[PDB]
Every structure is written in structure tokens, then in C-alpha cells.
Amino acid sequence: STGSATTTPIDSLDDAYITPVQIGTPAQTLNLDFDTGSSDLWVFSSETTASEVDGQTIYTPSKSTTAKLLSGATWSISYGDGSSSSGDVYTDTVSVGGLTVTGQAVESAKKVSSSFTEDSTIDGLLGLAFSTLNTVSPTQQKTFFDNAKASLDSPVFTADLGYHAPGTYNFGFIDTTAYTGSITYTAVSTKQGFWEWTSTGYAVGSGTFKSTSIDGIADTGTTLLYLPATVVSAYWAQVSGAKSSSSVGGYVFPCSATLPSFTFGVGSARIVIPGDYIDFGPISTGSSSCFGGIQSSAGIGINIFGDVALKAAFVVFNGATTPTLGFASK
């Protein structure tokens, strides 16, 4: 089998991407944030505290004839950005882009943190990291990809995120028309439950390539590109007027400045992030100070190749017995 779904930026800055997902019988369609950095499929629901729902579409398991309470099961997550949520668990039928899983754990939120309430466009998350990070207790549950894997034509999914435009998540096949050149594959460590890999280095604009190992994760659920302070300092040094602002909490720059591209290495191959991808607009409405899309990972404890980086590539998440990551230009 295969599946193919369009993924759409939630706003004009590509702060996140939503993908429609069919849950239950009859189908309830929710727009979920596909997140290769986490491993829970959780949704706004009829069980969510009323005051914490503000425009989201909810899953109502009582209206799904295929829903079954996973007795005794609870879940609770606190993301790397101070956001959290918790609740109970149902198993139900979940379809993405024509690909159907029966008995998928659907984690129904009783509580969500304010940041989720405040984002009306995101109805929940669909985790695509490794199932070892799933938070369901007492019995950890599998991700949508893990459950689909053996049925797929090939045990892979691909992320093709757009810049200020829709893109595509495919399951079970590689669309050879969606990228240029070849796909370069690179080793993955699953030791922290992430799609974790080592970039071979970077370049700033037309500058010379610096060969250096940068261990980090491919994370569709993180907006920005978080890299070591040395690397980030070297980037913003080439933007006149750019400064790191403690009050804002990162590098900012005047919108009149021209942003250089940023290149990262995948083996001997090179992915070029155009300068425009690194502009995240005024820090506040009407400000001439713009927020940067490349920021320091110091104090995160891990480097994160988020949407800023991934949307410059066609990315293969290969779930073979030994997982690997593939990157192509597009």
C-alpha cells in the first residue's frame, strides 16, 4: 500500500504545517501537525476542557463506531518548548492520504497548554519519530508509520515541505519526479528515539565550506534551524545590522538587510537553504526588526534541522531494519 497527502503552512511564515487525517467511522477529519520529532498521535477532542478549545476541530470518539477505549491508558507530554498536554487513549481507524491503519492509538486530550489553545489551525499532532518515545502508559503505543510499515510497498515515508506553499507527505514510495539529482543517504542513530544524523559541515552564502561534524535531528515539528553557537555566529556575522537580542531571545536583523544562503552537508552532497527561508518577519507588528530563522541550539542540548532546513530538500525517512535518512535537492 501507499498514501499521499498534501501538507499546508498554517500561516504566511511557515510556522508549522498541517495535514488532513481521517479518524474513525464515519471519518472525522482533523488537521494534524506531522512531527518527526515526537511519537504520539494526539488530538483535540470532546474530552478536552472546554475553556482550552478555541476554534480547533475535535475528535468525538463516542460518534465513531470503530473507537475503543484503551482501558487504563493515559498519556502526558511536555515538548521541548514548554508546551504540554495529556489525556486518555482510544484505538481507532486512521487514514492519511488513502493509507489506512486499523487499531491506531489515538490519544485524546483532556488538557492542553495555552500555546495549543491559541493556535486554532492545529487540531493535534501525528508523531513520526521512533515508537520508543511514545508516552502512553502502562503500555507504550506505536506510531502511525510503525503500524503501517509492514503493509507499505517500501518501509519509508517522505517529507517535501513547501516554502510559502503546500507540499507533500508520502508513505510507502519515493516520488522520483519530486526532486532533482540524486538522493544522498546518511546514517541514523535511534539511541535518543529521533531521526538523528551527522551533517558533514556548512557554508555561509558563497563562502567556503567548513568540514565539521554536526550531530542533529530531522524534525518536521520544529520551525527553525538550531545549530551550535559558533556556526550561528558565523552566519549572522554576514548580515549587516544583525544582533543577538536576549530580550527577544535570539538573533534579529533589519528587514532591509539581504540574507545569505546557508548550506549544510549530507555526506559529500550539499543542501542550499535560500536566504529568504531564514526570514521570519517582524518581531512585533510594525517593527523594522526581523526574527532570524537560524538560531543557537545552546541550552537545547541538541541541534535541530527543523522546517527551515528540511523545506529546502526532499527528505526520505527510511524505516528499514537499519533506518537511514536521505536528502535530495529539489
Side-chain angles (χ1 to χ4, degrees), residues 276-309:
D276 292 338
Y277 289 25
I278 296 162
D279 179 8
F280 278 77
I283 59 172
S284 286
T285 303
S287 180
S288 70
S289 182
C290 287
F291 198 67
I294 295 177
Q295 298 293 348
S296 181
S297 65
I300 295 180
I302 197 166
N303 299 308
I304 307 178
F305 295 87
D307 297 337
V308 162

PDB file of all heavy atoms in Angstrom, residues 276-309:
ATOM      1  N   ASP A 276      16.026  33.832   1.764  1.00  0.00           N
ATOM      2  CA  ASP A 276      14.636  34.151   2.096  1.00  0.00           C
ATOM      3  C   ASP A 276      13.985  33.171   3.090  1.00  0.00           C
ATOM      4  O   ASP A 276      13.015  33.543   3.784  1.00  0.00           O
ATOM      5  CB  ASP A 276      13.743  34.175   0.832  1.00  0.00           C
ATOM      6  CG  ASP A 276      14.059  35.302  -0.109  1.00  0.00           C
ATOM      7  OD1 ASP A 276      14.651  36.319   0.321  1.00  0.00           O
ATOM      8  OD2 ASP A 276      13.681  35.164  -1.291  1.00  0.00           O
ATOM      9  N   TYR A 277      14.480  31.931   3.151  1.00  0.00           N
ATOM     10  CA  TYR A 277      13.868  30.930   4.023  1.00  0.00           C
ATOM     11  C   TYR A 277      14.167  31.246   5.488  1.00  0.00           C
ATOM     12  O   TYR A 277      13.545  30.700   6.389  1.00  0.00           O
ATOM     13  CB  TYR A 277      14.373  29.521   3.724  1.00  0.00           C
ATOM     14  CG  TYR A 277      13.933  28.857   2.438  1.00  0.00           C
ATOM     15  CD1 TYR A 277      13.550  29.589   1.323  1.00  0.00           C
ATOM     16  CD2 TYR A 277      13.943  27.465   2.333  1.00  0.00           C
ATOM     17  CE1 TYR A 277      13.190  28.953   0.131  1.00  0.00           C
ATOM     18  CE2 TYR A 277      13.586  26.827   1.159  1.00  0.00           C
ATOM     19  CZ  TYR A 277      13.192  27.576   0.062  1.00  0.00           C
ATOM     20  OH  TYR A 277      12.832  26.943  -1.107  1.00  0.00           O
ATOM     21  N   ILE A 278      15.132  32.125   5.713  1.00  0.00           N
ATOM     22  CA  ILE A 278      15.659  32.402   7.038  1.00  0.00           C
ATOM     23  C   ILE A 278      15.005  33.663   7.651  1.00  0.00           C
ATOM     24  O   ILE A 278      15.292  34.043   8.792  1.00  0.00           O
ATOM     25  CB  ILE A 278      17.215  32.464   6.924  1.00  0.00           C
ATOM     26  CG1 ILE A 278      17.744  31.077   6.499  1.00  0.00           C
ATOM     27  CG2 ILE A 278      17.899  32.914   8.222  1.00  0.00           C
ATOM     28  CD1 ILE A 278      19.160  31.115   5.930  1.00  0.00           C
ATOM     29  N   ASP A 279      14.101  34.297   6.895  1.00  0.00           N
ATOM     30  CA  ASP A 279      13.367  35.487   7.347  1.00  0.00           C
ATOM     31  C   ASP A 279      12.031  35.101   7.983  1.00  0.00           C
ATOM     32  O   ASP A 279      11.178  34.519   7.312  1.00  0.00           O
ATOM     33  CB  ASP A 279      13.168  36.414   6.155  1.00  0.00           C
ATOM     34  CG  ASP A 279      12.411  37.677   6.485  1.00  0.00           C
ATOM     35  OD1 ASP A 279      12.135  37.954   7.662  1.00  0.00           O
ATOM     36  OD2 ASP A 279      12.109  38.423   5.520  1.00  0.00           O
ATOM     37  N   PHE A 280      11.862  35.386   9.274  1.00  0.00           N
ATOM     38  CA  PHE A 280      10.592  35.089   9.945  1.00  0.00           C
ATOM     39  C   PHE A 280       9.860  36.350  10.402  1.00  0.00           C
ATOM     40  O   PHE A 280       8.977  36.317  11.266  1.00  0.00           O
ATOM     41  CB  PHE A 280      10.832  34.083  11.083  1.00  0.00           C
ATOM     42  CG  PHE A 280      10.885  32.686  10.566  1.00  0.00           C
ATOM     43  CD1 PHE A 280      12.026  32.230   9.925  1.00  0.00           C
ATOM     44  CD2 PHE A 280       9.760  31.894  10.572  1.00  0.00           C
ATOM     45  CE1 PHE A 280      12.052  31.008   9.348  1.00  0.00           C
ATOM     46  CE2 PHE A 280       9.785  30.650  10.000  1.00  0.00           C
ATOM     47  CZ  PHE A 280      10.929  30.198   9.398  1.00  0.00           C
ATOM     48  N   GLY A 281      10.185  37.451   9.748  1.00  0.00           N
ATOM     49  CA  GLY A 281       9.360  38.643   9.796  1.00  0.00           C
ATOM     50  C   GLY A 281       9.493  39.466  11.047  1.00  0.00           C
ATOM     51  O   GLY A 281      10.279  39.151  11.936  1.00  0.00           O
ATOM     52  N   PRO A 282       8.702  40.532  11.127  1.00  0.00           N
ATOM     53  CA  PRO A 282       8.851  41.487  12.228  1.00  0.00           C
ATOM     54  C   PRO A 282       8.642  40.843  13.589  1.00  0.00           C
ATOM     55  O   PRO A 282       7.756  39.996  13.757  1.00  0.00           O
ATOM     56  CB  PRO A 282       7.779  42.534  11.927  1.00  0.00           C
ATOM     57  CG  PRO A 282       7.644  42.490  10.446  1.00  0.00           C
ATOM     58  CD  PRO A 282       7.796  41.036  10.083  1.00  0.00           C
ATOM     59  N   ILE A 283       9.447  41.251  14.562  1.00  0.00           N
ATOM     60  CA  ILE A 283       9.360  40.634  15.881  1.00  0.00           C
ATOM     61  C   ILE A 283       8.014  40.970  16.500  1.00  0.00           C
ATOM     62  O   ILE A 283       7.480  40.198  17.295  1.00  0.00           O
ATOM     63  CB  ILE A 283      10.526  41.051  16.805  1.00  0.00           C
ATOM     64  CG1 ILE A 283      10.579  42.565  17.000  1.00  0.00           C
ATOM     65  CG2 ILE A 283      11.865  40.508  16.261  1.00  0.00           C
ATOM     66  CD1 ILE A 283      11.570  42.995  18.044  1.00  0.00           C
ATOM     67  N   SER A 284       7.466  42.124  16.130  1.00  0.00           N
ATOM     68  CA  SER A 284       6.121  42.556  16.521  1.00  0.00           C
ATOM     69  C   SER A 284       5.533  43.356  15.377  1.00  0.00           C
ATOM     70  O   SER A 284       6.267  43.919  14.579  1.00  0.00           O
ATOM     71  CB  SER A 284       6.147  43.418  17.787  1.00  0.00           C
ATOM     72  OG  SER A 284       6.393  42.652  18.945  1.00  0.00           O
ATOM     73  N   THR A 285       4.213  43.429  15.294  1.00  0.00           N
ATOM     74  CA  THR A 285       3.599  44.129  14.182  1.00  0.00           C
ATOM     75  C   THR A 285       4.149  45.557  14.073  1.00  0.00           C
ATOM     76  O   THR A 285       4.181  46.310  15.048  1.00  0.00           O
ATOM     77  CB  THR A 285       2.086  44.164  14.329  1.00  0.00           C
ATOM     78  OG1 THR A 285       1.609  42.819  14.434  1.00  0.00           O
ATOM     79  CG2 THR A 285       1.452  44.842  13.137  1.00  0.00           C
ATOM     80  N   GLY A 286       4.602  45.909  12.875  1.00  0.00           N
ATOM     81  CA  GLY A 286       5.084  47.249  12.602  1.00  0.00           C
ATOM     82  C   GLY A 286       6.563  47.481  12.884  1.00  0.00           C
ATOM     83  O   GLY A 286       7.097  48.545  12.560  1.00  0.00           O
ATOM     84  N   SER A 287       7.230  46.503  13.489  1.00  0.00           N
ATOM     85  CA  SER A 287       8.646  46.634  13.807  1.00  0.00           C
ATOM     86  C   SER A 287       9.485  46.501  12.550  1.00  0.00           C
ATOM     87  O   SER A 287       9.158  45.715  11.652  1.00  0.00           O
ATOM     88  CB  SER A 287       9.093  45.573  14.823  1.00  0.00           C
ATOM     89  OG  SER A 287      10.473  45.720  15.130  1.00  0.00           O
ATOM     90  N   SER A 288      10.593  47.231  12.513  1.00  0.00           N
ATOM     91  CA  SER A 288      11.598  47.040  11.476  1.00  0.00           C
ATOM     92  C   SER A 288      12.648  45.988  11.822  1.00  0.00           C
ATOM     93  O   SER A 288      13.558  45.761  11.051  1.00  0.00           O
ATOM     94  CB  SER A 288      12.311  48.349  11.184  1.00  0.00           C
ATOM     95  OG  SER A 288      13.132  48.729  12.270  1.00  0.00           O
ATOM     96  N   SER A 289      12.534  45.365  12.988  1.00  0.00           N
ATOM     97  CA  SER A 289      13.444  44.292  13.395  1.00  0.00           C
ATOM     98  C   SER A 289      12.787  42.956  13.091  1.00  0.00           C
ATOM     99  O   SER A 289      11.652  42.725  13.470  1.00  0.00           O
ATOM    100  CB  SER A 289      13.790  44.435  14.880  1.00  0.00           C
ATOM    101  OG  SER A 289      14.703  43.449  15.320  1.00  0.00           O
ATOM    102  N   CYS A 290      13.516  42.104  12.379  1.00  0.00           N
ATOM    103  CA  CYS A 290      13.013  40.827  11.895  1.00  0.00           C
ATOM    104  C   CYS A 290      13.626  39.673  12.666  1.00  0.00           C
ATOM    105  O   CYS A 290      14.788  39.742  13.045  1.00  0.00           O
ATOM    106  CB  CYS A 290      13.334  40.682  10.415  1.00  0.00           C
ATOM    107  SG  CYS A 290      12.293  41.758   9.367  1.00  0.00           S
ATOM    108  N   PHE A 291      12.856  38.615  12.897  1.00  0.00           N
ATOM    109  CA  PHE A 291      13.393  37.438  13.587  1.00  0.00           C
ATOM    110  C   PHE A 291      14.070  36.472  12.624  1.00  0.00           C
ATOM    111  O   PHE A 291      13.542  36.154  11.573  1.00  0.00           O
ATOM    112  CB  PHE A 291      12.297  36.702  14.360  1.00  0.00           C
ATOM    113  CG  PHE A 291      12.834  35.763  15.421  1.00  0.00           C
ATOM    114  CD1 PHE A 291      13.487  36.257  16.534  1.00  0.00           C
ATOM    115  CD2 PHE A 291      12.696  34.393  15.296  1.00  0.00           C
ATOM    116  CE1 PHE A 291      13.976  35.414  17.501  1.00  0.00           C
ATOM    117  CE2 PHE A 291      13.181  33.543  16.263  1.00  0.00           C
ATOM    118  CZ  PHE A 291      13.830  34.050  17.359  1.00  0.00           C
ATOM    119  N   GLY A 292      15.248  35.994  13.022  1.00  0.00           N
ATOM    120  CA  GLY A 292      16.029  35.086  12.207  1.00  0.00           C
ATOM    121  C   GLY A 292      15.621  33.628  12.304  1.00  0.00           C
ATOM    122  O   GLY A 292      15.174  33.159  13.342  1.00  0.00           O
ATOM    123  N   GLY A 293      15.797  32.905  11.205  1.00  0.00           N
ATOM    124  CA  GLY A 293      15.402  31.506  11.146  1.00  0.00           C
ATOM    125  C   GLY A 293      16.466  30.493  11.494  1.00  0.00           C
ATOM    126  O   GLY A 293      16.213  29.280  11.448  1.00  0.00           O
ATOM    127  N   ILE A 294      17.664  30.995  11.773  1.00  0.00           N
ATOM    128  CA  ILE A 294      18.785  30.181  12.233  1.00  0.00           C
ATOM    129  C   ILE A 294      19.139  30.712  13.611  1.00  0.00           C
ATOM    130  O   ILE A 294      19.415  31.890  13.756  1.00  0.00           O
ATOM    131  CB  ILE A 294      19.998  30.265  11.291  1.00  0.00           C
ATOM    132  CG1 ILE A 294      19.655  29.675   9.927  1.00  0.00           C
ATOM    133  CG2 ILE A 294      21.221  29.610  11.943  1.00  0.00           C
ATOM    134  CD1 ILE A 294      20.766  29.783   8.894  1.00  0.00           C
ATOM    135  N   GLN A 295      19.121  29.843  14.612  1.00  0.00           N
ATOM    136  CA  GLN A 295      19.287  30.233  15.997  1.00  0.00           C
ATOM    137  C   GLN A 295      20.185  29.225  16.709  1.00  0.00           C
ATOM    138  O   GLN A 295      20.366  28.098  16.252  1.00  0.00           O
ATOM    139  CB  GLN A 295      17.935  30.336  16.707  1.00  0.00           C
ATOM    140  CG  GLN A 295      16.994  31.386  16.125  1.00  0.00           C
ATOM    141  CD  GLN A 295      17.478  32.822  16.318  1.00  0.00           C
ATOM    142  OE1 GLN A 295      18.409  33.093  17.081  1.00  0.00           O
ATOM    143  NE2 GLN A 295      16.839  33.753  15.616  1.00  0.00           N
ATOM    144  N   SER A 296      20.753  29.653  17.821  1.00  0.00           N
ATOM    145  CA  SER A 296      21.620  28.804  18.595  1.00  0.00           C
ATOM    146  C   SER A 296      20.881  27.673  19.296  1.00  0.00           C
ATOM    147  O   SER A 296      19.814  27.874  19.890  1.00  0.00           O
ATOM    148  CB  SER A 296      22.350  29.636  19.645  1.00  0.00           C
ATOM    149  OG  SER A 296      23.218  28.788  20.383  1.00  0.00           O
ATOM    150  N   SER A 297      21.502  26.491  19.265  1.00  0.00           N
ATOM    151  CA  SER A 297      20.997  25.334  19.990  1.00  0.00           C
ATOM    152  C   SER A 297      21.573  25.239  21.389  1.00  0.00           C
ATOM    153  O   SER A 297      21.318  24.272  22.086  1.00  0.00           O
ATOM    154  CB  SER A 297      21.329  24.037  19.252  1.00  0.00           C
ATOM    155  OG  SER A 297      22.737  23.842  19.205  1.00  0.00           O
ATOM    156  N   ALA A 298      22.386  26.199  21.805  1.00  0.00           N
ATOM    157  CA  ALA A 298      23.000  26.106  23.119  1.00  0.00           C
ATOM    158  C   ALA A 298      21.873  26.108  24.156  1.00  0.00           C
ATOM    159  O   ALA A 298      20.949  26.915  24.084  1.00  0.00           O
ATOM    160  CB  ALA A 298      23.970  27.254  23.337  1.00  0.00           C
ATOM    161  N   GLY A 299      21.909  25.192  25.105  1.00  0.00           N
ATOM    162  CA  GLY A 299      20.826  25.146  26.070  1.00  0.00           C
ATOM    163  C   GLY A 299      19.566  24.429  25.608  1.00  0.00           C
ATOM    164  O   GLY A 299      18.616  24.309  26.383  1.00  0.00           O
ATOM    165  N   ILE A 300      19.541  23.969  24.359  1.00  0.00           N
ATOM    166  CA  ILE A 300      18.550  22.978  23.926  1.00  0.00           C
ATOM    167  C   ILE A 300      19.127  21.602  24.186  1.00  0.00           C
ATOM    168  O   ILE A 300      18.404  20.658  24.521  1.00  0.00           O
ATOM    169  CB  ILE A 300      18.169  23.098  22.428  1.00  0.00           C
ATOM    170  CG1 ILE A 300      17.470  24.422  22.136  1.00  0.00           C
ATOM    171  CG2 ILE A 300      17.256  21.921  22.029  1.00  0.00           C
ATOM    172  CD1 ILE A 300      17.070  24.596  20.675  1.00  0.00           C
ATOM    173  N   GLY A 301      20.433  21.480  23.994  1.00  0.00           N
ATOM    174  CA  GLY A 301      21.112  20.226  24.233  1.00  0.00           C
ATOM    175  C   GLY A 301      21.185  19.336  23.012  1.00  0.00           C
ATOM    176  O   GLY A 301      21.761  18.256  23.068  1.00  0.00           O
ATOM    177  N   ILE A 302      20.606  19.779  21.902  1.00  0.00           N
ATOM    178  CA  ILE A 302      20.682  19.013  20.668  1.00  0.00           C
ATOM    179  C   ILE A 302      20.503  19.978  19.500  1.00  0.00           C
ATOM    180  O   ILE A 302      19.806  20.985  19.616  1.00  0.00           O
ATOM    181  CB  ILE A 302      19.639  17.857  20.656  1.00  0.00           C
ATOM    182  CG1 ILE A 302      19.988  16.826  19.579  1.00  0.00           C
ATOM    183  CG2 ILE A 302      18.237  18.392  20.466  1.00  0.00           C
ATOM    184  CD1 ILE A 302      19.233  15.491  19.714  1.00  0.00           C
ATOM    185  N   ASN A 303      21.148  19.687  18.379  1.00  0.00           N
ATOM    186  CA  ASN A 303      20.946  20.501  17.185  1.00  0.00           C
ATOM    187  C   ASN A 303      19.696  20.015  16.475  1.00  0.00           C
ATOM    188  O   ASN A 303      19.422  18.813  16.457  1.00  0.00           O
ATOM    189  CB  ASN A 303      22.162  20.429  16.264  1.00  0.00           C
ATOM    190  CG  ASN A 303      23.425  20.959  16.929  1.00  0.00           C
ATOM    191  OD1 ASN A 303      23.442  22.067  17.456  1.00  0.00           O
ATOM    192  ND2 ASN A 303      24.478  20.157  16.927  1.00  0.00           N
ATOM    193  N   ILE A 304      18.938  20.934  15.871  1.00  0.00           N
ATOM    194  CA  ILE A 304      17.659  20.555  15.262  1.00  0.00           C
ATOM    195  C   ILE A 304      17.589  21.105  13.847  1.00  0.00           C
ATOM    196  O   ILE A 304      17.560  22.328  13.644  1.00  0.00           O
ATOM    197  CB  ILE A 304      16.437  21.060  16.065  1.00  0.00           C
ATOM    198  CG1 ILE A 304      16.504  20.634  17.530  1.00  0.00           C
ATOM    199  CG2 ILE A 304      15.150  20.539  15.421  1.00  0.00           C
ATOM    200  CD1 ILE A 304      15.348  21.152  18.383  1.00  0.00           C
ATOM    201  N   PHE A 305      17.569  20.197  12.874  1.00  0.00           N
ATOM    202  CA  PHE A 305      17.252  20.530  11.498  1.00  0.00           C
ATOM    203  C   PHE A 305      15.732  20.589  11.348  1.00  0.00           C
ATOM    204  O   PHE A 305      15.081  19.603  10.977  1.00  0.00           O
ATOM    205  CB  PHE A 305      17.880  19.512  10.544  1.00  0.00           C
ATOM    206  CG  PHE A 305      19.384  19.543  10.559  1.00  0.00           C
ATOM    207  CD1 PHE A 305      20.104  18.790  11.475  1.00  0.00           C
ATOM    208  CD2 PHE A 305      20.082  20.359   9.679  1.00  0.00           C
ATOM    209  CE1 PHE A 305      21.485  18.844  11.511  1.00  0.00           C
ATOM    210  CE2 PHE A 305      21.463  20.412   9.705  1.00  0.00           C
ATOM    211  CZ  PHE A 305      22.164  19.652  10.614  1.00  0.00           C
ATOM    212  N   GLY A 306      15.169  21.737  11.693  1.00  0.00           N
ATOM    213  CA  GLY A 306      13.739  21.963  11.587  1.00  0.00           C
ATOM    214  C   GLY A 306      13.292  22.369  10.192  1.00  0.00           C
ATOM    215  O   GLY A 306      14.024  22.211   9.223  1.00  0.00           O
ATOM    216  N   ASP A 307      12.080  22.903  10.098  1.00  0.00           N
ATOM    217  CA  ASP A 307      11.461  23.173   8.801  1.00  0.00           C
ATOM    218  C   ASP A 307      12.325  24.067   7.903  1.00  0.00           C
ATOM    219  O   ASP A 307      12.367  23.871   6.698  1.00  0.00           O
ATOM    220  CB  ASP A 307      10.078  23.818   8.987  1.00  0.00           C
ATOM    221  CG  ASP A 307       9.086  22.903   9.702  1.00  0.00           C
ATOM    222  OD1 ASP A 307       9.275  21.660   9.672  1.00  0.00           O
ATOM    223  OD2 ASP A 307       8.126  23.420  10.303  1.00  0.00           O
ATOM    224  N   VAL A 308      12.981  25.068   8.476  1.00  0.00           N
ATOM    225  CA  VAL A 308      13.838  25.945   7.676  1.00  0.00           C
ATOM    226  C   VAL A 308      14.808  25.147   6.808  1.00  0.00           C
ATOM    227  O   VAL A 308      15.040  25.492   5.651  1.00  0.00           O
ATOM    228  CB  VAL A 308      14.597  26.936   8.590  1.00  0.00           C
ATOM    229  CG1 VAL A 308      15.789  27.553   7.884  1.00  0.00           C
ATOM    230  CG2 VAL A 308      13.654  28.035   9.072  1.00  0.00           C
ATOM    231  N   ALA A 309      15.400  24.101   7.374  1.00  0.00           N
ATOM    232  CA  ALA A 309      16.339  23.256   6.654  1.00  0.00           C
ATOM    233  C   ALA A 309      15.610  22.241   5.791  1.00  0.00           C
ATOM    234  O   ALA A 309      15.939  22.077   4.616  1.00  0.00           O
ATOM    235  CB  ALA A 309      17.263  22.549   7.609  1.00  0.00           C
TER     236      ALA A 309
END
